[PDB]
Design an enzyme around this catalytic site. Structure first.
Site, PDB file in Angstrom:
ATOM      1  N   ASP A 170       0.822  -1.195   0.000  1.00 27.44           N
ATOM      2  CA  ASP A 170       0.000   0.000   0.000  1.00 27.44           C
ATOM      3  C   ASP A 170       0.859   1.250   0.000  1.00 27.44           C
ATOM      4  OD1 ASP A 170      -2.879   1.051   2.078  1.00 27.44           O
ATOM      5  OD2 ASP A 170      -1.904   2.034   0.430  1.00 27.44           O
ATOM      6  N   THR A 171       1.059   1.818  -1.199  1.00 22.02           N
ATOM      7  CA  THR A 171       1.854   3.030  -1.396  1.00 22.02           C
ATOM      8  C   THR A 171       1.206   4.279  -0.758  1.00 22.02           C
ATOM      9  OG1 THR A 171       0.898   3.385  -3.640  1.00 22.02           O
ATOM     10  CG2 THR A 171       2.993   2.130  -3.501  1.00 22.02           C
ATOM     11  N   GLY A 172      -0.109   4.240  -0.529  1.00 15.90           N
ATOM     12  CA  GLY A 172      -0.806   5.358   0.095  1.00 15.90           C
ATOM     13  C   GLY A 172      -0.900   5.264   1.603  1.00 15.90           C
TER      14      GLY A 172
END
Ligand code: AB1
Lengths: 99, 99
Positions: free
Chosen positions: B25-27
């Site tokens: 999860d880059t966010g």
């Protein structure tokens, strides 16, 4: 571009004639933008994150330019703390994870 | 591996002797896991997502193996609907976004 993850992956977008910063977000199915001026018709919808739900407006086939790559799709608009580009649009600009 | 985003980027992790599935999860700044049995000391903390805030337990220097790449760092434990691997660990396994 290759983007490392030491900082937030924030990119510049152009949507509805306006310029915004948004998070490239692999853990988001959908695209959620701050309260903003968008043209067209909508359908009430609820997005669900960590900590619960926000009421959003759902616009279909909205044009967005994300770091200079055009994509057309669904955009949610509501009281998100940060602009989020989700996988519905990330797939369209050819975005991958790599390790 | 290279991971396209037509589906959720779910990987297998080994943490605290247990096997789980988690979202790359880059966010996410931080890593958040569902209620689980972890050894050690902690500090109360609040994680803030799209719907508001969850109370979590913060554990430092926890070993995780994400798709066979070891990383050590802060894991948060609490009432998330999805196991989330955040950029704090994603940088340790050399994860990048590419488009
Ligand atoms: C899952 C989903 C489905 C449909 C539509 C959308 C937009 C969806 O995604 C919404 C969503 O909250 N996804 C999260 C991960 C997710 C997927 C499925 C269920 C639950 C969560 C995550 O990726 C983005 C969201 C962004 C954010 C929110 C508030 C403040 C700052 C940033 N990030 C966070 O919540 C992270 C958490 C995970 C440590 N976070 C919160 C502490 C501050 N920093 C930070 O990075």
């Amino acid at each position: 571009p290759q983007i490392t993850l030491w900082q937030r992956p924030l990119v510049t977008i152009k949507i509805g004639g306006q310029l915004k910063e948004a998070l490239l977000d692999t853990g988001a199915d959908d695209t959620v933008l701050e309260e903003m001026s968008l043209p067209g018709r909508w359908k009430p919808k609820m997005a669900g994150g960590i900590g619960g739900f926000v009421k959003v407006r759902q616009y279909d086939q909205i044009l967005i330019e994300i770091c200079g790559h055009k994509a057309i799709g669904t955009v949610l608009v509501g009281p998100t703390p940060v602009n989020i580009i989700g996988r519905n649009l990330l797939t369209q600009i050819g975005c991958t994870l790599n390790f």
